[PDB]
């Protein structure tokens, strides 16, 4: 098998300045002494939203991070966007499962409270794909987070891995060898699912799943929904017409609308 | 605005030389540009050492070719030095385009001569895919290497990248974004210029089913290098990319084994 893996480390070439917003390059240190790299975008607000990227990307993720950051800033929110450990410019050598990414979220929140408590009286999180798993876990283990949005969160990580390799079946083995060390890590069933936090989450959660997501099924997300419904009356579910994490681009107006009113309701 | 920059993946496997009934040493190799590489020194009680070079998306643990080639070399009687290229596996490094891997091979050779020169009077190289290019380049510029084996070496890189993008295109857009860093990793050439310099024994291996490298392209390297070097060989197989060692294990080990014993004088 595979002991430790890490997806290709990527860095984009756009800054909040390209969105006509000023920002600061900050450095957050986790409790296990890992140095994270990120952006602190002061928007003159008391509310801060933290976007969380997926397994293979970074804070620069052109397909959802850049649109969501521009969206949050124009709504008037402060934004803290950092690369997860072993991603982008952040510290750390191996991602593997990414179970320690919750520590990155804790450090980021703690950093906000320690340096800018007036700018983070309300803190929300938005996660995409694997980043949604961290955001979901954040609502359960991080008390300062008041609300969270989970876009396309893999419920059963093992099934998600097996559904991914099907697109490599008709293709040469050299192509599947790229993702094989990563797909086999989740297919075994060792990493913890988000179903683990269905009884511990008592905060507003916005679940977004695509009707055409072939990696994550709606009914799998619906299972998480009414599991948590017993404990949390503020969990919402929106079924979209987009594939995996593509809603924010393919249906941008409807995304910004529903997410906008979710945040507007729970961010104070 | 795209990718400013993309680094290789890190792949670390479970297995060790112990699973091959061989004891080993975890070594740290420093390059001339101060890059610390991680690797295995497998002492087999020999004066001869063979260095197996891996692909640009894997490491020393690549079970489809790295594990059987190390086991093959060990059961042959050779000492084995297997290290991850920079920013691959456990090694350090931004690995740029990939031109720095020749420095990694030089570091390994230097490390052998500095630590165990008696156990490396003869040094040979075996490279797979892009690792075969490092072996081909290494056989031309590194004096301490007596011979080399090149399995599925890309001859026309841009032609190989073009063929590769065709199969990437058969992936859905939303899924391609996940593996797009792999594609850009190779988009960071004249390999045929090494047909003039190489005058050491070279063993080329290319499969007919290779969707990335054509037999015609490797054969061009063979015929060109053939009238400055009388000891260059070509073996055309009926296997996919770097799969000959897996599809035809006893054929591969026999021809490579005979090649080494002949030139590891």
Tell me what the structure shows.
The structure is a homodimer. Chain A contains nine helices and ten strands. With 268 residues, the first copy, chain A, is α/β, with parallel strands linked by helices. Chain A has one domain. Chain A has an eight-stranded mixed beta sheet, sandwiched between helices. In chain A, helix 2 crosses helix 3 (130-141) and helix 4 runs antiparallel to helix 6 (180-187). The first copy, chain A, is globular and about 50 Å long. Strand 1 (2-6) of chain A pairs antiparallel with strand 2 of chain B. Chain A: It comes from Pyrococcus furiosus (strain ATCC 43587 / DSM 3638 / JCM 8422 / Vc1). Chain A: This is Xaa-Pro dipeptidyl-peptidase-like domain-containing protein.
Helix and strand content put the structural class of chain A at alpha/beta
Alpha-carbon distance between the termini of chain A?
48 Å
Q: Which strand order does the major sheet of chain A show?
A: 3-4-6-5-7-8-9-10
**What is the number of beta strands of chain A?**
10
Q: Could you tell me the radius of gyration of chain A in angstroms? A: 18 Å
Strand content of chain A: 15-25%
Q: Give the chain pair forming the largest contact, with residue counts.
A: A-B, 40 and 38 residues
Number of helices of chain A: 9
Assembly type: homodimer
What shape does the CA trace of chain A take? globular
Largest sheet of chain A: 8 strands, mixed
The arrangement of helices and strands of chain A along the chain is EEEEEHEHEHEHHHEHEHH
Domain count of chain A: 1
Helix content of chain A: 25-40%
């Amino acid at each position: 098998g595979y002991k430790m893996v890490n997806p290709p480390r990527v860095v984009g070439n756009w800054t909040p300045k390209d969105l006509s917003f000023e920002y600061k390059d900050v450095e957050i240190t986790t409790e296990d002494n890992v140095k994270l790299s990120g952006w602190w975008i002061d928007n003159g607000s008391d509310k801060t939203v933290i976007p969380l990227h997926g397994y293979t990307s970074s804070r620069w993720a052109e397909h959802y991070m850049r649109p969501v950051i521009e969206f949050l800033l124009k709504e008037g929110y402060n934004v803290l966007a950092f690369d997860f450990r072993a991603h982008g410019k952040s510290g750390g050598k191996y991602t593997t499962v990414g179970d320690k990414e919750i520590l990155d979220l804790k450090a980021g929140v703690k950093w906000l409270k320690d340096n800018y408590p007036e700018k983070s009286k309300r803190i929300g999180v938005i996660g995409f794909s694997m980043g949604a798993l961290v955001a979901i876990r954040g609502l359960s283990e991080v008390k300062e987070i008041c609300c969270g949005v989970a876009d396309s969160p893999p419920i059963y990580l093992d099934k998600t891995g097996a559904r991914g390799m099907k697109y490599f079946a008709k293709l040469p083995e050299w192509l599947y060898s790229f993702v094989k060390p990563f797909s086999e890590l989740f297919s075994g069933g060792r990493p913890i699912n988000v179903l683990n936090y269905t009884n511990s989450i008592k905060k507003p959660l916005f679940l977004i799943i695509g009707r055409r997501d072939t990696l994550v099924k709606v009914e799998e997300v619906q299972e998480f929904y009414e599991r948590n419904k017993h404990v949390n009356p503020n969990v919402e579910l929106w079924v979209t017409d987009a594939p995996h994490v593509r809603t924010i681009q393919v249906f941008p107006e409807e995304w910004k609308s529903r997410v906008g009113e979710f945040l507007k309701r729970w961010m104070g």
